[PDB]
Amino acid sequence: DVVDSSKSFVMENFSSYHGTKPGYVDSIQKGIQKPKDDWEGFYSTDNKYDAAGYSVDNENPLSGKAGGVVKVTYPGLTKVLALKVDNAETIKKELGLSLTEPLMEQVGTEEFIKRFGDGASRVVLSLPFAEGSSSVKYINNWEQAKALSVELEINFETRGKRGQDAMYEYMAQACASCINLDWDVIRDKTKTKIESLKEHGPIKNKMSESPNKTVSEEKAKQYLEEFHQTALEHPELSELKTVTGTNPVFAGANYAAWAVNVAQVIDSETADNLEKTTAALSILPGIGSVMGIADGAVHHNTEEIVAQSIALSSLMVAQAIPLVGELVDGFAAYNFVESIINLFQVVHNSYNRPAYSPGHKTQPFLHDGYAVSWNTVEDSIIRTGFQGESGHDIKITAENTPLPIAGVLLPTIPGKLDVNKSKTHISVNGRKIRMRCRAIDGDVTFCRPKSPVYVGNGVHANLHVAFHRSSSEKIHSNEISSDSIGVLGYQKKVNSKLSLFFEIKSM
Amino acid sequence: VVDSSKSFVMENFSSYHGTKPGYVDSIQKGIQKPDDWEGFYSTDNKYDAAGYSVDNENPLSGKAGGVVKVTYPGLTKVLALKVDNAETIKKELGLSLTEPLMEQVGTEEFIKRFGDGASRVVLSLPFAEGSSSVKYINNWEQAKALSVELEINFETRGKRGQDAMYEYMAQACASCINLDWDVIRDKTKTKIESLKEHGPIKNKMSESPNKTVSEEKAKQYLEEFHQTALEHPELSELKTVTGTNPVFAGANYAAWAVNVAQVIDSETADNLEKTTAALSILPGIGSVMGIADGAVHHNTEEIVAQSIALSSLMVAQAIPLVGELVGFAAYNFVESIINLFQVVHNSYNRPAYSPGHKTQPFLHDGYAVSWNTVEDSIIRTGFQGESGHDIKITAENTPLPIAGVLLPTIPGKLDVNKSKTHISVNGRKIRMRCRAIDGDVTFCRPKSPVYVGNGVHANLHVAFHRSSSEKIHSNEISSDSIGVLGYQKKVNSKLSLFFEIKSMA
């Protein structure tokens, strides 16, 4: 019951990876030893890029140096025992172990290695590494881990790069879409741009026109938006001017709101220390405006445009420190650039990692105040290759006032996929509402509720979509245009569009 | 597939059937039919049955018929099913995969194997998500045995609109919006008339271009009208209760009235069902209804009448500026909006989990957070050992931070397992540094920056350790929620996931 046989195997020269903190990259290669409770043991993973994320200075985890990644290998045969649950008690009861001795102590006995090892010399436990990941984590008994041989995958400190660039440049190989930026180039171009802009003519003439004394947030954002406009005319920011001109997330006013907000929270104690600056910056809103990240996309994905945005942000913080600050320099050009760069790398890394987009599987689709999601993963799958019925639950609510649900657009395929008009319905806080379904064309049925549906704070709906298949012939991608069910919200003549994405699969 | 805990035998088994206008008296002569689920449908909940009683040709606005109670004499087996897929049911319960399920249900061999001696079988299924009622599926021929008596005839109450049905449905709650819609209709007609002759308002209709204009100007005139109309003393209470919350501001009544006049043409204003279908798809109705932040604020007949009267006048004023017709404002507009009021009020009277409870999302400041599963939202007690709990987190557009999480602790009983507690961002696992704030609250910060946004989500895994098999008593626990902290504005955006303490089962 608790062992997943599909994830269990025996293997010769079983290898795994271990992230190593600075100062241990070379010592750990002399053998795994325990330092001077069911889960006490040596930890590793099958994904060396996830290993790399355990490698940062423990005293300065936000900003410190990354150590390395090493590869550990068991001689001979090793049993990888994948467990379906991470509760040790549940595991010891259901495997007939002694519920007293720790779980990882027993994993290392000869008696356990016989009952579960399949002839191998040792057992390693395997568990899901994390939600949203396909990696595994391996738990090794410490005594058994003395057999491991340890060699080097990478030493980030040996690369001799600034900040955490080496670690994140390594992690970006995972997707070698992919944001793979040369952060040496970006730093150098950033330094050059701040210098060449502080020594401009109208920028000089716009720093001349500055209150240069603690005024209210209002005059500050006004002057800062002015500065922004003036600074954006320089030819070293001309591409930035172009990619930030339409999307309102990238407007002067958000740069100004960013720079004001930075100056409010950065005092001298903080500005004096990189780790403290990064923590402070890392809890601010609006970092999307300077990163160029909006609508599910990293728009600023070239070294040149990123350097421009960071330089422009560097200037505006410099200008915002006297107007709404207790601080008295400099920070804008050094620790603020270091720190923001680190936050860039963090978010870029997130966007490079495989992830389900809004409205896919059980990820919510957030739009116009609505929140909609497939109730479970299986609901988002339209199974094919049988005659008969399926049902699919979509959750719907909204953030505050009552917003309508006008209906739902559903996919159909002549002969293979039909809306079951009798089982399809929508339920609002348990009130069950029937639907009037009408084909738009041969591929789309529109279903509208027979009484008004509203959702809002405290009011939710479950839309239950029922499909009927009149043939057992499978569906091929030729036949389906849409890959989404369109839930329609309020009308503005257009309807707000809430999309739930499905995949067609066999059993 | 049979849930034996919901299955029983009963003498004089009774249930309710919603009945559409025209058949209230006809149906009491006996249940007669006019594929796997062909059959007669009833429910254990007579207020849910009432929702089936509306004219099938004007389901939005039509007249409501009634509810009857049907009773089987002798013994009835209620067979509750764990699935509503007939194929799966016919396979697991060894039946002809050929014959319809509800035909087999009414055969003597079915009644032998499953009836427990009872004369006939009724199938029971969950009525709906978010509901605790059941639907009963009766074999048609077996249903001929039913005696049928009248629970209520909404048409006999002689009331306007769907008032009688919704007034019936409000009994389920005896917190309960139970409004007298007769009174609200009377007070509403009275105020529209009594505002139409006012001095300043008559003179604020004087200054109306009474000719098509730009929407941007239309809203300026109507916000003007709104301010002037709100000084009338028949609206004095409305002025007080709408003065602070920006959902209830004049600009929002103006947007409502403008959007109304845009979609009502002559064909539409002359037919109540078509008015209601058109009004029902507009945004902003919460401004008129006084509904915001999870609460029905306008919950008195007087204040609802005031709000509906004012909206009516403003619609009246917005049709010449932005519209195409005559009268609508005081006739079909009022009837239709009243029905939309009753729909939403009924939703708020029904039992429902609030945001952040069970798997209902908590939507705040652009974030969306929820418990992954119902069981995650329960902290079990009465044992020594561990539990884990998953919270989903994302945000609507740009990257927003997650600063940390506030967790409950109990000196000696409930502690944060700092090794297993972590947060994972698109699969990147991030350890946490946890530090007690007092004896009752721990604060865990992620050791790398966490951001969520469109396409970037997080799973917060909270693990709890109990060093005592003694149960937690409501006393020991101050909060009923886990506090996830977002961005700093000096305060953090507060995202609340509410839990319940329960013993093992």
Author numbering:
A (entry chain A): 4 to 39, 48 to 187, 200 to 352, 354 to 516, 522 to 536
B (entry chain B): 5 to 38, 48 to 187, 200 to 351, 354 to 516, 522 to 537
Tell me, in the authors' exact words, what the paper reports.
After the binding of the R-domain to the EGFR-like receptor on the cell surface, the toxin is endocytosed into the cell, and acidification inside the endosome promotes the requisite conformational change and membrane insertion of the T-domain followed by the translocation of the C-domain into the cytosol. Following translocation, the C-domain is proteolyzed from the R and T domains and proceeds to inhibit the EF2 translation factor, leading to the termination of protein synthesis and cell death.
DT was crystallized under varying buffer conditions in an effort to determine if conformational changes, particularly in the T-domain, are observed with a decreasing pH. Since the crystallization conditions were identical except for the buffer, the crystals of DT-5.0, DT-5.5, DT-6.0, and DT-7.0 have similar unit cell dimensions and diffraction resolutions. Overall, all of the structures are very similar, with RMSD deviations between the Cα atoms of 0.34 Å (997 residues, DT-5.5), 0.38 Å (999 residues, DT-6.0), and 0.41 Å (1000 residues, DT-7.0). One region that stands out is the TH2-TH3 region of the T-domain, which consistently displays large B-factors in each subunit of all structures. Interestingly, the residues between H223 to P234, which span TH2, appear to become more flexible at a lower pH. Analysis of the B-factors for each structure shows ordered TH2 residues in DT-7.0 and slightly higher B-factors in this region for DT-6.0 in each subunit (TH2-A and TH2-B). As such, these structures suggest that the structural stability of TH2 is pH-dependent. The set of the structures generated for mildly acidic pH values of 6, 5.5, and 5 retain essentially the same conformations, with the hotspots of partial unfolding highlighted by the elevated B-factors. We demonstrate that neither catalytic nor receptor-binding domains change their structure upon this acidification, while the T-domain undergoes a conformational change that results in the unfolding of TH2–3 helices.
